[PDB]
Structures are given as structure tokens and as C-alpha cells.
Amino acid sequence: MDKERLARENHSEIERRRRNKMTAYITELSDMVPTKPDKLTILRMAVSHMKSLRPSFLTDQELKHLILEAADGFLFIVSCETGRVVYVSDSVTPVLNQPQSEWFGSTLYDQVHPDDVDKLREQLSTSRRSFICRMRCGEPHFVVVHCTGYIKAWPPAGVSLPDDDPEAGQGSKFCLVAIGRLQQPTEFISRHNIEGIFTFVDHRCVATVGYQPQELLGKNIVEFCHPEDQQLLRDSFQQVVKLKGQVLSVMFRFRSKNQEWLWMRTSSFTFQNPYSDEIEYIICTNTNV
Amino acid sequence: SNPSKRHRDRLNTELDRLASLLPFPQDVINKLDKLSVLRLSVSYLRAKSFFDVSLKGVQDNCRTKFREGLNLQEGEFLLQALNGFVLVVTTDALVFYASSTIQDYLGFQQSDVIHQSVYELIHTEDRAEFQRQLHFMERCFVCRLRCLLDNGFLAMNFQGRLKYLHGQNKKGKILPPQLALFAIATPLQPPSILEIRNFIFRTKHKLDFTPTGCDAKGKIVLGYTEAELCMRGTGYQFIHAADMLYCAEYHVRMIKTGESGMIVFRLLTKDNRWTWVQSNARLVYKNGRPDYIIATQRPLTDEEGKEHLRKRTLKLPFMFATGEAVLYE
DNA sequence: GCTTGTCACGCGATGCCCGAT
DNA sequence: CATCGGGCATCGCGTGACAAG
Numbered sequence: 001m002d003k004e005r006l007a008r009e010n011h012s013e014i015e016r017r018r019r020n021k022m023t024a025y026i027t028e029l030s031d032m033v034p035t036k037p038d039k040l041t042i043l044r045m046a047v048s049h050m051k052s053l054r055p056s057f058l059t060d061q062e063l064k065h066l067i068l069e070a071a072d073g074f075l076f077i078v079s080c081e082t083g084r085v086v087y088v089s090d091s092v093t094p095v096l097n098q099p100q101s102e103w104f105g106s107t108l109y110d111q112v113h114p115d116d117v118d119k120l121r122e123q124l125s126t127s128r129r130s131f132i133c134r135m136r137c138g139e140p141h142f143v144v145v146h147c148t149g150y151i152k153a154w155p156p157a158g159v160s161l162p163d164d165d166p167e168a169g170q171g172s173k174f175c176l177v178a179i180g181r182l183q184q185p186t187e188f189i190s191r192h193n194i195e196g197i198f199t200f201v202d203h204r205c206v207a208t209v210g211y212q213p214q215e216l217l218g219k220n221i222v223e224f225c226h227p228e229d230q231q232l233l234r235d236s237f238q239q240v241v242k243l244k245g246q247v248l249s250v251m252f253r254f255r256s257k258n259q260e261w262l263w264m265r266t267s268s269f270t271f272q273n274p275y276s277d278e279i280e281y282i283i284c285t286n287t288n289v
Numbered sequence: 290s291n292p293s294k295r296h297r298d299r300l301n302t303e304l305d306r307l308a309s310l311l312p313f314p315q316d317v318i319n320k321l322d323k324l325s326v327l328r329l330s331v332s333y334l335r336a337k338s339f340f341d342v343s344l345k346g347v348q349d350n351c352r353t354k355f356r357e358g359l360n361l362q363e364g365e366f367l368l369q370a371l372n373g374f375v376l377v378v379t380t381d382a383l384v385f386y387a388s389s390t391i392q393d394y395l396g397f398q399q400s401d402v403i404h405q406s407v408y409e410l411i412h413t414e415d416r417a418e419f420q421r422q423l424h425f426m427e428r429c430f431v432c433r434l435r436c437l438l439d440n441g442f443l444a445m446n447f448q449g450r451l452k453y454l455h456g457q458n459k460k461g462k463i464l465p466p467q468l469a470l471f472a473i474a475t476p477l478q479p480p481s482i483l484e485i486r487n488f489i490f491r492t493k494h495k496l497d498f499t500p501t502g503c504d505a506k507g508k509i510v511l512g513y514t515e516a517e518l519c520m521r522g523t524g525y526q527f528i529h530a531a532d533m534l535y536c537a538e539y540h541v542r543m544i545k546t547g548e549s550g551m552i553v554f555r556l557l558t559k560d561n562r563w564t565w566v567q568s569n570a571r572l573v574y575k576n577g578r579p580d581y582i583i584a585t586q587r588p589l590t591d592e593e594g595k596e597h598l599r600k601r602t603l604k605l606p607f608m609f610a611t612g613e614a615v616l617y618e
Numbered sequence: 619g620c621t622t623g624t625c626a627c628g629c630g631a632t633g634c635c636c637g638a639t
Numbered sequence: 640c641a642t643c644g645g646g647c648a649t650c651g652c653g654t655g656a657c658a659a660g
């Protein structure tokens with residue numbers, strides 16, 4: 001219709017529903033404070049209640065509460081210089097079943113799996129960090145932990161460092177402030193050293209064995225193989241080296257991530273260095289049966 | 290002098306008193322409108338009422354004053370370690386809360402998002418999935434939210450739970466609490482290295498392609514230093530499995546003619562990432578017989594690496610395989 | 619030079635309060 | 640014990656000033 005009137009009536013409706021939102025908010029405030037009154041009474045009671053309740057919208061522990069309710073985890077602040085545990089929150093008890101007694105006075109290297117101790121180093125050398133390791137907990141018990149965090153300049157602003165504090169003589173230059181949290185018939189290809197260690201894992205593994213590629217790399221394939229099928233799979237891996245370029249097929253059952261046994265046919269052959277004719281790796285095509 | 294003018298003056302002075310009490314910096318308070326003032330005070334009241342039910346540091350056997358100072362900001366430390374932001378949303382798709390870091394990731398200031406419908410931030414193609422997530426109770430999903438930094442969207446992983454939002458005092462002509470999503474939203478993560486910088490780099494290898502030298506830019510791109518670069522096997526230990534046969538063919542071509550020809554493949558970096566390269570392998574001779582290889586690579590992007598892969602000349606097994614790798618000494 | 623939105627304002631229709639019936 | 644008219648306060652409506660984008 002007419003230009004000016006279309007604009008005018010839509011402005012009418014905009015102001016009308018502005019007043020509607022206002023009234024709705026005021027009745028929300030009426031629902032939200034201790035104690036039918038008109039809108040001015042509601043506003044005065046609300047400002048009195050807000051003055052009784054009282055810069056950030058939430059207090060520090062409310063923010064922490066929201067975070068930990070959402071996705072668990074525990075905060076740890078270590079130093080990159082030695083991995084020394086500068087700080088660890090209380091939530092490490094519900095996460096690792098460990099007291100704060102165990103992490104203070106220690107380093108992060110003492111709290112993770114030994115074979116991870118070097119991966120840790122690569123994450124602490126010299127913004128964001130995101131890795132996974134195995135942390136401790138009547139014999140030793142490790143659990144997978146996904147850590148994510150950042151590198152911060154030490155000491156933090158606003159936190160006083162007294163003279164007699166144990167941190168006074170530390171003098172770290174950088175810190176990892178992170179949070180750590182717990183936790184189909186196809187085929188996939190893989191590469192192995194002549195000892196049998198996964199060194200390349202096809203992404204189709206999740207569709208065939210359910211594991212993520214990271215869950216397979218670095219481990220020997222026999223580790224996932226039924227204790228009986230192990231000597232046969234080993235003989236296959238050793239004879240595939242003697243017969244370079246030849247195909248060796250072998251059937252064996254593979255423990256899925258759901259800890260089921262899946263029968264698989266693995267066909268292996270060597271990779272020949274085109275100059276030296278030396279074995280670079282073993283190519284396997286692991287197929288479900 | 291005017292009746293209704295003085296009535297609305299009373300309304301406005303109470304609105305001013307309400308705005309003065311909001312837990313925001315005064316530079317944020319001054320640029321607030323009255324509607325947002327009421328909305329934010331409602332949000333603050335609902336938050337404090339829920340915390341009065343749900344909530345309440347260093348165990349007193351480890352107590353140092355620096356540790357106590359750190360504990361008093363433990364919350365902000367966790368917030369900075371999120372690499373993302375907290376989102377609490379109600380069954381009515383109302384943003385019960387969003388952390389300040391949302392401004393760092395989407396450009397929306399926290400002041401403008403609370404007590405507003407979360408769908409205003411979410412792609413129309415993903416609001417259905419989000420609402421399906423809003424209604425056995427842990428949650429893990431993906432969603433694309435509005436990105437004002439791009440000015441433009443951002444795909445984010447949401448990890449969270451549904452917990453009863455107490456203290457909301459809902460009614461009907463008194464209601465029980467309903468499930469609100471408490472979640473952390475983080476960006477998505479890619480797996481391949483692309484150089485932003487032309488960054489041509491040469492490396493020397495033995496006749497079996499075992500690396501022996503590498504220039505500066507090569508270090509900048511692949512992440513290894515010289516020693517660790519040579520002590521990891523030959524060159525085939527770094528090559529993506531979907532490319533090893535093509536590089537082997539071009540290696541035999543170089544063995545038989547001296548020149549590789551322009552080949553395209555992927556190489557494993559120190560952080561176990563794949564980087565695309567267009568490379569060329571030439572043989573230097575000593576006394577008329579091959580001595581070593583000088584392979585020069587140009588860093589490529591995935592958009593052109595995949596284009597080279599789809600216009601592949603030869604086709605060989607594992608050509609389209611995708612996967613991760615490792616490398617030891 | 620247009621769009622969207624905030625704020626104030628004029629204006630009556632009821633609302634509350636309360637001497638006076 | 641109400642009922643009833645005063646005058647001011649609430650309250651919702653539409654429009655104009657003005658400004659950020």
C-alpha cells in the first residue's frame with residue numbers, strides 16, 4: 001500500500017510490542033523477587049532485592065559451577081619449565097579419584113603415563129593446546145584424559161605473590177593453564193613397521209573396528225588380536241618380509257572397541273624402496289568378514 | 290507539571306536505579322536501553338535464584354596464599370581454558386547465560402544475548418537440530434552459529450548436559466523446573482597444514498631418498514630440525530599412504546632419466562599433520578654417477594591439493610585413502 | 619538519504635483513595 | 640455498614656524527534 005502509512009503502522013506495532021515486552025519483563029521481576037501490585041511497586045521491590053543481592057555477571061564460583069556442571073573436568077596450572085604443578089582445583093578428586101595432596105609438590109610428568117611423558121614435553125615446549133594422555137588414580141590405574149588449555153605469562157595479574165610463598169623462588173616464565181576431562185562391514189588400509197606397529201591408519205577403521213585412528217597408531221596390531229591368533233599373525237608378518245612384493249593373506253579375530261571379536265582377513269605385502277629395494281613398511285588391507 | 294509525565298518520571302527514576310545496580314561495567318550500563326535494562330535485571334535475578342539452589346576451594350591442608358589467590362579466580366581460569374564459551378539455554382530456547390568469551394568467538398557481547406532467544410544466533414539450517422537436542426541426558430553435537438568477526442558463520446562443537454533449572458518460579462492459572470542445556474561450545478578442528486605465505490624449500494636426500502639436509506623454510510613448514518629430519522628413515526616414511534606409489538613411480542622416473550617431473554603429494558609434519566607439496570626431484574652426479582637428490586617443494590593448499598588429486602594422471606591402489614600417521618626414530 | 623529503533627510526550631480510559639453521602 | 644463522585648495516579652496507545660547504522 002502507501003509508503004508512509006506502511007512505515008507508520010509498522011512503527012505503531014513496534015512500539016506496541018515494545019510496551020508488551022516491557023510489561024512482560026516487569027511481571028517476570030514480580031515472579032522473581034520475594035513478594036497484585038502495580039508496576040512501580042514491582043520495580044521498587046526489585047531494586048531493593050537487587051541491592052540486597054549486591055564487575056562480572058556471575059561470581060567466580062558461579063562461573064566455575066556452570067562450566068563443571070556442563071562438561072566436568074578439572075583445572076590444572078603447571079609450568080612449561082619443568083611441568084611443576086603450580087595449582088590444581090578440588091575437582092581433581094571427582095575426576096581422577098586423587099586428592100589435591102597428590103598433585104601439589106609434583107610435576108605433570110609424574111602424574112601421566114610414562115610412555116606419554118615425551119608427548120607431554122612436545123606440548124610444553126616454549127597459544128592454545130589440546131592433547132590427550134593417561135593420568136594416574138590396589139596397583140596403578142591410568143585413565144584417558146582429554147586436556148585443553150593455553151599458555152599464560154607467569155605470574156598472573158591481580159594474584160599477589162607474597163615473599164614467604166613457595167612460589168617466590170620459582171620464577172616461572174610460562175604456564176599451561178588447562179582443564180582435563182575424562183573419557184558395519186567395511187575395510188581399512190594400514191601401514192606397519194616390520195615389527196607390526198601401526199604407523200598409518202585409514203579413517204575407515206571406525207567403521208570396521210570402531211577405534212579412532214589415534215587409538216591404533218603406535219600400538220602393535222597383535223595387541224588387538226585374540227591370544228590364539230597371535231602366533232599365526234606374527235608368522236604372517238615375518239614371512240611377508242621374506243617374500244617381498246608377494247601377498248600374504250591371513251584370517252584372525254580383532255577385538256573391537258566394544259570388546260567384541262570380529263573376524264578379519266588381512267592381506268599384507270612389502271613396500272620396496274625403488275633404489276635400495278629395502279622394506280619401507282608393510283601395507284595391510286584389513287577387511288571385515 | 291503534568292500528571293502522566295511525573296508518573297513516567299517515577300517509572301524512569303526506578304529504571305535508572307535498576308540500571309545502576311546491574312553487575313556490568315558502567316560503560317556497558319550507560320549504553321543500555323530501558324528494555325535491555327529490565328531484561329538484564331530479570332536475567333541476574335533468575336541466575337542468582339538458580340544458584341541459591343544449585344551452588345553452595347583449596348583443601349585446608351595444602352593452603353598457601355598464592356594458591357588461595359589462584360583459587361579465587363579458578364572460575365575465570367577455567368573459562369579461559371575452555372577455548373570457547375559456556376551456554377545455558379532453557380526449554381523456551383532462552384539464553385539463560387553466556388560467558389563473556391562469546392564476544393571473542395562470535396562477536397556478540399554477553400550483554401545482548403542473555404534472556405534472548407538462542408535461535409537468533411543459530412543457523413536456520415541447524416535450529417531444528419538444536420531444538421531436538423534441547424528435549425541418557427548427556428549431549429554431544431555440532432551447530433553453526435552467527436559470526437560477527439567474519440563481518441559469516443562458525444561451526445561449533447557443543448558438549449554438555451540437560452539439568453533441571455531450579456528457582457525459575459514458573460506458573461499457570463506453580464510449575465516444576467524444566468531441563469536446561471548446560472553446554473560448552475568450542476570451534477571445529479582441521480587436520481592439514483596450509484602455508485599462509487611463495488615458500489619454496491629445498492631438501493637434500495640420499496639416493497634412497499633418505500633426507501640429509503634441509504633449508505630454513507623447510508624447517509618452518511615441516512616442523513622438524515635437521516637431525517630429527519634425517520633420523521626418521523627415508524623419505525617414504527613421511528609420505529601419505531595415498532601418495533607413496535606415485536612418488537615411487539616418479540622416483541624410478543628420476544632414477545632412469547635424472548628428473549622426477551612435477552609431482553603432488555602429502556608430507557607428515559612434526560606434529561603429525563599432512564601438508565600438501567608440489568615437488569621435483571633432481572639427481573646431482575659425481576664422476577658421472579648419481580650422488581644425491583635435491584628435491585624442491587612448494588607448499589600447496591588443500592583446495593588445490595585436492596584438485597591435483599582429482600585430476601590425477603596415473604591411478605594406483607589406495608589413491609583416495611584418508612588417514613593419520615606417526616613417525617619414530 | 620533510507621531504515622530501524624529508542625525515548626518522550628499528548629491523551630484519554632480506568633484505577634486507587636477517600637470524604638461525603 | 641456499604642455507595643458515590645474528586646482528583647490524582649496507572650496504564651495502554653499512537654505519533655513525532657532524533658539518532659545510530
Ligand SMILES: CC(C)c1c(O)cc(/C=C/c2ccccc2)cc1O
Pocket residue numbers: 492498500511518523524525526527528535536537539540549552556568569570584
Ligand atoms: C625430509 C622429508 C620431509 C621429505 C622431503 O623433504 C621431500 C620428499 C620428496 C620425495 C619425492 C619423491 C618422489 C618425487 C619427488 C620427491 C619426501 C620427504 O619425506
